Structures are given as structure tokens and as C-alpha cells.
Amino acid sequence: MIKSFNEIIMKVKSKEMKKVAVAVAQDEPVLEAVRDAKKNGIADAILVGDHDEIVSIALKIGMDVNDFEIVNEPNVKKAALKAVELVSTGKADMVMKGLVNTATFLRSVLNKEVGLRTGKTMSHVAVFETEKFDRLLFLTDVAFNTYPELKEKIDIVNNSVKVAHAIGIENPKVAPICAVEVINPKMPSTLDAAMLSKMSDRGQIKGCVVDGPLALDIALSEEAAHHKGVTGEVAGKADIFLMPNIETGNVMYKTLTYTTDSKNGGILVGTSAPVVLTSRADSHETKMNSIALAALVAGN
Amino acid sequence: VPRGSHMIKSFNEIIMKVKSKEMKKVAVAVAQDEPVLEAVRDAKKNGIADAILVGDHDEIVSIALKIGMDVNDFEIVNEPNVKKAALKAVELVSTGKADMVMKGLVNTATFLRSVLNKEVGLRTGKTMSHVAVFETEKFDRLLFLTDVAFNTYPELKEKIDIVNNSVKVAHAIGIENPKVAPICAVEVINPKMPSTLDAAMLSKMSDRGQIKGCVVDGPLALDIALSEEAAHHKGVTGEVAGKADIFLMPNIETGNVMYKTLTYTTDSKNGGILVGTSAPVVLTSRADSHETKMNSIALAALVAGN
Amino acid sequence: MIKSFNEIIMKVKSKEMKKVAVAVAQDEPVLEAVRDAKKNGIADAILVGDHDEIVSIALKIGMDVNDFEIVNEPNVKKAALKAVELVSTGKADMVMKGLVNTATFLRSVLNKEVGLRTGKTMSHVAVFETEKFDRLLFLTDVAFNTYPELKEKIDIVNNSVKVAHAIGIENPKVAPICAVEVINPKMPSTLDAAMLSKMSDRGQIKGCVVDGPLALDIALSEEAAHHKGVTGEVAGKADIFLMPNIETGNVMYKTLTYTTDSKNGGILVGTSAPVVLTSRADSHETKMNSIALAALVAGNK
Amino acid sequence: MIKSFNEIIMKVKSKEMKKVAVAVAQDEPVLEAVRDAKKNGIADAILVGDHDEIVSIALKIGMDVNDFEIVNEPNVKKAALKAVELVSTGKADMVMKGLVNTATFLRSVLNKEVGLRTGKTMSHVAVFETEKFDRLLFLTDVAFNTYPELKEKIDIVNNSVKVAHAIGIENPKVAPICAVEVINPKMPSTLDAAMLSKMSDRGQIKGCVVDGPLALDIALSEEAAHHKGVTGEVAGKADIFLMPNIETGNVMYKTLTYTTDSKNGGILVGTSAPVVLTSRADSHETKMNSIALAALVAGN
């Protein structure tokens, strides 16, 4: 029954507040996000980085410095590792990449000594609110995992269904997206999709229904699914769109992002705690929606 | 034994359907074989099949006298040459002068090289497979087993035709919506077990109507395939678990052993044909009973009847 | 030059009408299209197939069959070979599909005896008019070529440049879309991108400018291009978007047509004459935009 | 010497009661079998599991809890280990499998510190008493080893003949089962088959005769072996049926039990002590006979 980033933010404000640890918090756009997140009751924050620069930027943007702890680390690589150390030892619920390149940030998340590393694979989950589809649309994996095979895709699916579970979708419909809705032994997408689908059928994957392969029209639309005579629980009702690799996943996200005015957020899951990872490309509202999601997950 | 919801569940039902229909014609490849001529006589007495006897006219007529078979009830074609006799029986079939082929006094390899002849043979381009049909005490349902005799190590391309050929036989028997279970060791996808991957991809093909006129659901272990009690205690649900009509084997070892076990450890009525050719092939054996010879004819006679 | 479908259709009305052959014309939705196409003044058409099942539908829909030619062929397959023939034998300027399934219709166009074979690969181009962008956007290949290699991708590009020429873009900006804008041996798409950019440079791909690999956003948006310090004739001004394969392709196509109100049309090129291959999936006005696209490419040549 | 499960059970009662160590005793079917084993004096038992849950089940079935020892361990994974520790350290003579997935039970039996680990490959031995045949047919491996090759098959055979020795078959007749009774380079199982038959001939595999390949029928039936004119000490009189892979052997196994009034039982060997890997779908009598086998073997 949860269909909008507004009902998402509302539910966040309804639960106990959560703490985010900013990795190199000298980022002005990130702190702008931490602030409007703190005042409206979405999330708290610990700022890890250069005390003097952080405090400078905070005055400029009218952000009470006395609202937040600030662990002073001038070194950028150490500032990142300390934000993750804060979360791995449960003094914080989430990490937000700050003024660090996504590579060094992701090494720290992955640190074998103090990181958030797990048994499962790490995966990105993007979420979208469209003018044209009343339910929420989740895309995994659009960012981190390049050419994942079955071993990875199982985990990529479990990680995304955890996120739909948090948003309140009890039993979400997972469509492995391919070019065609049909087993085709020259397209290994569809073979992975058949196998995930048997896996759901037998309870090796739980808390969802998986039915692929499915082209993107068959997964989105009832009219299209009927046009090509595809039946079952997922055609025209897909909550989760499992992308076959990064190339397809990235082109889909950016088509939505650059051709639509769709409210969207994204988080990294699979780790021991949710990770927020924005770019100067993401808007303040995306950054909001992103923290907003990372919160809901961490309270589940 | 709980009661099956099919129309046809036994070989007496199978043979009475054969008899409810226009007589089909069998080309016997090398007819100078008494157990096959015994079989072919009784086929004619009881209205199951007409036969053309292809081979050495002199010995066919001798053996006919020995078994009280009335040679006026049957066209004979004189080919004293064995290799050429098997080929002729096959050519008669491919040129629609008889509906099915039977092996007589020929070695299996020769007969088969004959059926697969490039010029006069029975090739269709899809793969040829053996379907075995059994009537067990313990299940009120015909069981179909594929491939138990021909395909040795089929991969997905072959299993798809082995499945479609299965469904054609079931349809001919009278099962319009058969239930097919790709048998493996387990009921779960295991990367270290190719059978199960193959089972998954056939199952999605069934679901999207790439395979038609059936429900394919696997992998399933044999116990979940037939027993509802086993399906139940193992939490396995769906249209095939406990109700499997067709048992697709992962290979000839699995098929052969299943089959040899049923024959030497039960008294289950059984019959077998080869299909996927342009016409059904009875490939009977010195080991099969007179009853098994007859059932085999009756199966072909139905595949051809469609 | 041209920046809208309204402009494509006006400019198509400028020229002399072009005949379309409908392979199995007994199709309500395609005949509603062929009809609208004649009243507006876009195309005349030969309606090949069952003369009786065609008139029943003609009457139903309110098109006097007198304004059209009819070639009676009651066989599905023969009507489609005959459709393709009326183009191949110079009597019509493009083929569009009807009741024939897609596979049979594609055997019919690529027929060796009377077909439209050119020896160069047959590619599908899709064309988009979006609110967020003023230039027409071209997506190849989205429909036909599944996993093209460098040699099939040269042709894919060359067909698309031919189409963009016919719209009035005399130098199309071609971006080999890829996950990243940097070269990556692990991503075969980036390799083919580099190799393709090189052939543009040496004037081995003529009449256009190819620069890849480019993430879609670098190719779409001047702002995205700038913020990642990627420059050149293409980045942020891309006209043709070269999809690395059909999975990436199919998904960018359906994401546009299901989440936006962008007008679009599609033709298959790399053939002697344009081919329109339309579907229940396609709207009525995208069937039109598609017919109009073929007529512009047929007319320019 | 011993030709029936009644005889197996007479020799078990004949000698001193041994103890099952049930891995997680909160299982009605397992306790129903452990109860009938105590009654008939086939074996004692230590039940390792959730004490409270154990007793209400012992109440539900007529099990007098005073006739068993209960080691209280609520944690399923730890209950599986304690069961094995009791065997490894000689307080019991077998493990049996309760409310655990097979993966968690086998890993516990294969434990490095406290396990029943050994030199030998673990192999399953099934054992049948059929109507049509006067001797016990033993099947190996129908359950544990998936795609064994020559090295594992040698251990599967040795393990196999060791069990036959305890039944009183002094010189058992091992048939490597294949589709055909002749060599064929395109059927790997026949290569392995003559491989193994040479090792018998050379005396490398001792205490048995090994002849193959043999089709199942040649091995079973004097008639079938006579008809295809196959001779030697094994054709027509095979005691042990060495299967080519789990798929083949599971299908013989499940065909035989769901299609016949055969009685059967099975244990895992190779380990330092017999194991009883029970199934959800095993009957009461199979679980019983299976305990009986484990007891008979632990008497050797």
C-alpha cells in the first residue's frame, strides 16, 4: 500500500530516529542534506573529517554545529575508515560518502578489519516514483555489480527484497529483466532468470515471487503482458526489476533520471549496515530520499 | 491406491482404444522371426494392426505354417537380403504404404541405421527418442519414461525434443494435459548438478508456452515426482509434484536402471516405442514378453492414429 | 535541420507520395493506419492478401477500398513474398507488416530470389521526440541485431547515419553508449566503442562523427558531459545512440515509451527499401510516425 | 549368511545395546523410531536438543523420557555438534539426524576438532530385502557422493564390502552398474567399471570380487546374465550395486521403495562411526532398520 517517497519520509519520522556517519564531512552539498534531514526528523548524524573546514561550511549554511558530534580527522582516507568504524561497532546506523572518491570510500566500507563486510554480495538498490505507475519501482543492480552471474544475482535479489520488506511490500514481485520473455540459450540472462525463478518456486529464495525472463514492457504493464500472453504473478505487476548487468541497469536509471521528473533515491545494501552513496549529479531531494531509505532499512 | 483423474490409466484401456479405430499397418523389417510373427498374428486376430512382412518369403511362409498364421491375412515382400529387407520395411513407411516399423531378425544397429537412412529413412530433423510406458500396481496412472534406451547424454537442445515426443505419445494415449517431471537427485537448483539447471529451463519454457500441451515442473526427485505423500512431507507444491505422468531422465544410466528395476523387481505391464521420426518405431527384443511386444504395437498404433 | 514528427510529416507531404506494400493487409489496426496515412496525404498503399477478409475490414473501418490497390493472395506466406516483391521490382517504395508473424515476415524481406537483401547488415533505427530535449534522438539497434560484433556495428551505424541524413542532420553525432565513458577490457562494449571512434576519425565511417565509449548521460546532457570533463564534437550533443547489444537496447526503448509521452517511430534499414514492422504494442500515432519515417528515407534515397 | 532385516535385528539384540546420539531430538518421527528401538532392545539413545520441546513430543507419543538421557541444547547448530562429540568421544556409537537441514548435520559430522572425520571418503550404503530376490541387495552411493570418479569409487567400494562383511557375506560380489554390459569410450562409467575390475583382479581392492560394466539386469538376474551370455563370479549374483552417480542411484533407490513392498535401511560409512542421515519421507520401518544397521556395524 506504500507508493510514494512522501509516505516513505512519513514512516521514517514515525519510527525512532537513526544516526548517519559522514565519511569526509567537508562536503557542502552533503551537510546541506544532513541539516534538512535533522530538522524534519528523518535522521541524526556524526560528522567525521576536518574539524575546522566542517565548522566553517556549517555557519555558511545555517546548520547548528551544537546539533551534531564531530570526530576530527584531517586525513581523508582515515576520516572515511572512522565513519565505517563508527557503524561496524554500532555507534551509528548508516554511512554517507562525503568529500571522497567512490573507490577509496568503498575500500573502507569493505575494510576486512573494521568494515561492514558480510557473507553476501554488496548490491545497489535504486527506487523510483513515476507519473505513469502507481506502485514504487526498484532497480538492482544499477551501480556496483558489473557482470554478476547466478551466485551474485541470488544475493542481489535477497538484498533488494529486504529493502522492499522495509518499505512495507510483504511479498514483492521480482522480474529478472531480459530482451525477450522467452528462454534463449544464446542469451545467458534468460538462463539465470529461469533458475532464480525455480529457486523462488521451491523456497530457496523467500519473501517474494520471482518470474523471469520478462522484457521490460511485460514486467511494467498489464496491457503489454496481455498483448504477449504472459500470465502468472509478476507480468504487469513487477515491484523489483533485476537488471542482467550494469550496462542495461545504468542506461535504464539514466533514461528515467534524464528524461523524466521522477522522484528517486538509491542506497547500497548487502553490507552489515546500509550505505548512502550520492554524486554531485544527485539532487538535494535525491540525497534526502536516499538518507530517507537508508533509515527505513536500518530500522528493520 | 488413490484413483487417477485421467481417462486412460491401463493397457487394456489402451488396446480397446486401438480397436475402437481404423486398423494401422506395420512393416516388419526382417519378418523371419517367430516371436515377432507370434506377436503380429495376435495383433491381427484381435484387431490391433495389419502387417506387411518384408524379408525371405520362403521362411516367413514356413514359420507362418508352424504358428498357424494364415499368410493370406498379410502382404509379403520378398527381400532375402537382410540389410535391404530392413531398408525396404523403412521405405514402405516413409512413402505412406504402412504406418509404423517393427524390427525382426536384424541386429539393433543395422535396423536403426536403416530407420535413420538419409534417402528413404524417417528423419524429421528433431531428435529421435525412446518412450517406455508402464502400469504399476501401486499407481492408478500410466507412467511414461524418456529416454531409457537411445539418447545417452542429452543436453537442453535434445531434452526439449525428448519432452515434446513424450507429450505426443501421451496425447495419442488420451492424456491432453500430461505432467512432466525432469527427474534429478534433488528438488532444488544446485549449480554443481547440470540436470537441475536443465530442469529449470524446460520448466520456464513450459510456463511461456515454448513447450506446449503439458506442464513441465522440475527439478524433482523421483519420490516427489510420483508420491503425493512424499510431495507433502517435503513441502513441494504445484501441478506436477505427486501427479507426474512423464519422467524425463537426466541420462541413459538413470533411465536404464529405473527401467531394469521396474522389469526385474515388479510384474508391471509395460511397452515401448521410438518417436521423433516421421512415424513410430517398435524396437522389440528377445527379452520382452509376448504381452510387451503387443503393448508396444498398440502404442505405435495410437501415435500413428493421431 | 528537422526537430519534430510534425515537421517529418509536413516535409513528407512536400514530396511525391510513396507506395507502401502491406504484406497481409487483413489487419484492423494496420488498415486504420494505411487509411489515416492516405487521408492526411502521407502514403498510397498496395493491400496484399485475402481480397474478401480485407473488404470486410475496409467496410467495418470506413475506408473505400477504391482509393487503394488490392493484390489478392489468400496464402499468408505468399502474400508476404508478393508484398516484398512489389518493392524489390520497383512498383512500391516500402513494405510494412500485417497478419504475418515476425519471423516469416523477416524471411520474406531477406528473401534471396525477390527480397531486399543488400549484403550490408539490416539494422533497426528507433526515433524519439522528448520534452526534455529539442533534437530528435535515434536509438539503434533496439529490435533486430541481438549481439553485434564490430563488423555488424559498422553497418548498424552506417544505416542510422543514412536515416539521420534523410531528416536533414548532415553530420550526425554518434555515441557508442556504454556503462562507463572510460575504456575497460572487462567491458567489451568499451573496446568496440574505441575501434568505432577510430574509424570515424580516419574517414572509414563517412558522413558522421563517432566518439565513444560514453555513458548515456554524457551523451544526452551538456551539463553531465561538462561535470565529468568529457569534451569533443559528440559528448552532451549526441544524435545517434549506438546500443552495445539488444538487452541494453530493448530496455532504453521501453523505458522511454512506458514512462514518458515522447512521440516515436521505427523503420528497419540496411535494405533496398525501408521496412515498417509495427505491433499491438505500438500506438496508432507511432504506426503513423513509423510510416512517415520510411516515406522520408524512401523519398530522399 | 544373513538374508533379511529380521535376521539383522536378531544379531543386533544378540549383542550389547549401543547408543544413538540424536542430533536435534525435537522430531516426532525420529523419536517414534528411537522409542521402538528401545522397546525392541535394538539400541539406547541420548537425545540432544530443546529439552522442553523434546518432552511434550515424548508425551504426545508414548515415549517414557526416563528410559533415555536428554542433553539440553536449545541452539540447533550446537545440538548437532554435541550429538557428534558424544560419538567422537565414545559416550555413543552412532549419530542420527533430527530437526536439522542435511548441510548443517553433515558439516557437524565432518567437523575437524570433534567430528567423525577420517582418511576415507564418506559413502552412503542403502540395503534392500526384496520379494523377487533371496539375498540382500546393497546400493552405494544413492544419497551422499554426487559425481564420484575412480578415487572416490574405490572408497565407495571398500566402505561397501566392510558393511557386507558385518552382515556375514565373506566374499561379496560388486557390480559397477552402467547402461550397457560392455566397454564404450563415450560412456565414462564403463571406463571406471573395468578400471575397478582390474584392481580386484590385481588384489588392490580386497575382500570381494569386482566385475563390470554390467547393466542392472545382468547383475540381478541369473536369467538376464545367461540370456546375454555373461559369465564370471559377479554376473547374475551381484550383492553390491556400485552406482555411477547419485542421480542413477537415487532413482533406483526411490523406484524400488515407492513401487515395491521391499523393506530397506541405510547408514553413512567411511566416518569413524556409522551415521543415520534420516529423511522427511523415510517410513517408520526404514528409520528403524537404519538404526539397526548402524548398531550392527558399530558391533564391528
Author numbering:
A (entry chain B), D (entry chain D): 1 to 300
B (entry chain C): -5 to 300
C (entry chain A): 1 to 301
From the paper:
Phosphotransbutyrylase (phosphate butyryltransferase, PTB) plays a crucial role in butyrate metabolism by catalyzing the reversible conversion of butyryl-CoA into butyryl phosphate. During the acidogenic phase in C. acetobutylicum, phosphotransbutyrylase (PTB, E.C. 2.3.1.8) and butyrate kinase (BUK, E.C. 2.7.2.7) play crucial roles in the production of butyrate from butyryl-CoA. These enzymes also produce ATP by enzyme catalysis, and thus, they also play an important role in the energy metabolism of the organism. To understand the molecular mechanism of the butyrate biosynthesis of C. acetobutylicum, we determined the crystal structure of phosphotransbutyrylase from C. acetobutylicum (CaPTB, phosphate butyryltransferase) at a 2.9 Å resolution.
The CaPTB monomer consists of two α/β domains, which can be divided into the N-terminal domain (ND, residue Met1–Arg117 and Ser272–Lys301) and the C-terminal domain (CD, residue Thr118–Thr271). An active site cleft was formed between two domains that is known to show an open-close conformation change during substrate-binding. The asymmetric unit contains eight CaPTB molecules forming an octamer. The octamer structure of the CaPTB consists of four dimers that are connected in a caterpillar track-like arrangement. The contacts for octamerization are mediated by hydrogen bonds and salt bridges between residues including Glu181–Arg202, Lys198–Asp211 and Asp211–Arg202. The hydrophobic interactions also heavily contribute to the octamerization using residues including Leu191, Ala194 and Met195, and these residues are located mainly in α7 of the C-terminal domains in each subunit. The CaPTB dimer is formed by hydrogen bonds and salt bridge of the loop of β13– β14 and helix α8 and α10 between C-terminal domains in subunits A–B, including Lys132–Asp261 and Asp217–Lys254. Instead, we observed four sulfate ions, which were added during the crystallization procedure, at the active site cleft formed between the two domains. The sulfate ions were stabilized by hydrogen bonds with the residues Lys254, Ser279, Ser283, Thr286, and Lys228. Because the structure of CaPTB is an apo form, whereas other compared structures are complexed form with the substrate, the structural difference at the α5 and α11 might indicate that PTB undergoes an open-close conformational change upon the substrate binding.
